[PDB]
Enzyme design. Sequence first.
Site, PDB file in Angstrom:
ATOM      1  CG  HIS A  58      -2.214  -0.925   0.712  1.00 33.26           C
ATOM      2  ND1 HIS A  58      -2.423  -2.146   1.318  1.00 33.26           N
ATOM      3  CD2 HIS A  58      -3.142  -0.820  -0.268  1.00 33.26           C
ATOM      4  CE1 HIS A  58      -3.468  -2.739   0.753  1.00 33.26           C
ATOM      5  NE2 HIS A  58      -3.915  -1.954  -0.213  1.00 33.26           N
ATOM      6  CD1 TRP A  86      -5.690   1.572   1.811  1.00 36.51           C
ATOM      7  CD2 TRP A  86      -6.572  -0.235   0.841  1.00 36.51           C
ATOM      8  NE1 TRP A  86      -5.764   1.819   0.456  1.00 36.51           N
ATOM      9  CE2 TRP A  86      -6.306   0.717  -0.156  1.00 36.51           C
ATOM     10  CE3 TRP A  86      -7.121  -1.466   0.474  1.00 36.51           C
ATOM     11  CZ2 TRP A  86      -6.582   0.481  -1.510  1.00 36.51           C
ATOM     12  CZ3 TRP A  86      -7.401  -1.697  -0.870  1.00 36.51           C
ATOM     13  CH2 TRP A  86      -7.120  -0.735  -1.836  1.00 36.51           C
ATOM     14  CG  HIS A 108      -8.201  -6.926  -7.429  1.00 37.77           C
ATOM     15  ND1 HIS A 108      -9.001  -6.292  -8.352  1.00 37.77           N
ATOM     16  CD2 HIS A 108      -6.929  -6.743  -7.844  1.00 37.77           C
ATOM     17  CE1 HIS A 108      -8.239  -5.727  -9.274  1.00 37.77           C
ATOM     18  NE2 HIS A 108      -6.977  -5.992  -8.990  1.00 37.77           N
ATOM     19  CE1 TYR A 122      -2.908  -4.470 -11.151  1.00 39.32           C
ATOM     20  CE2 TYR A 122      -3.002  -5.752  -9.122  1.00 39.32           C
ATOM     21  CZ  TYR A 122      -3.620  -4.962 -10.087  1.00 39.32           C
ATOM     22  OH  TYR A 122      -4.963  -4.648 -10.025  1.00 39.32           O
TER      23      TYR A 122
END
Length: 189
Positions: free
Chosen positions: A16, A86, A169, A184
């Site tokens: 993050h 988050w 995800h 990714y």
Amino acid sequence: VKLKTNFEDPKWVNRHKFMFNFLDINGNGKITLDEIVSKASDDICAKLGATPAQTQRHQEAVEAFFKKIGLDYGKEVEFPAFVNGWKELAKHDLKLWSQNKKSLIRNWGEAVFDIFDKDGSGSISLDEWKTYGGISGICPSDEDAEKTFKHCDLDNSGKLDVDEMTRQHLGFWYTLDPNADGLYGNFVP
Ligand SMILES: [Ca+2]
């Protein structure tokens, strides 16, 4: 999909932070919902040639997603508060998903894929992921985009569907599920 979080793992905090730094394009250590929604609408949707209705559904999804993290219009959020946000979102969405309900992350995925989807499949091709990846910047090379598809379980068309990307995800953004590592490619750690 794993349901337990790993909020104390520096790898999750750093994933993050990496993304925060990516959003913090002006380098001031702060992010606003204005900036986020502008990226979603004025930048991505415009470049994708999205329709008015697609652009609006996508903006609503991005707005709901980041409001859950604590962002708001005219409010500057720094990294410590962002990553604490988050935690709110992760618990919220994992609960929903585990109960077969629509999550904010799923809603975002539907809105993005819908821009590309011409046949009702709720799926995108490798080339469409390359397009989205390069325009948003989150998958900034073709090789990384290829890694996403190699990584995921594709459907009978060789396409990535929204349910599969949603599961990935959850693990990548919410729970630090090792099965989601490399989602990714080599870009996002
Ligand atoms: Ca900033």
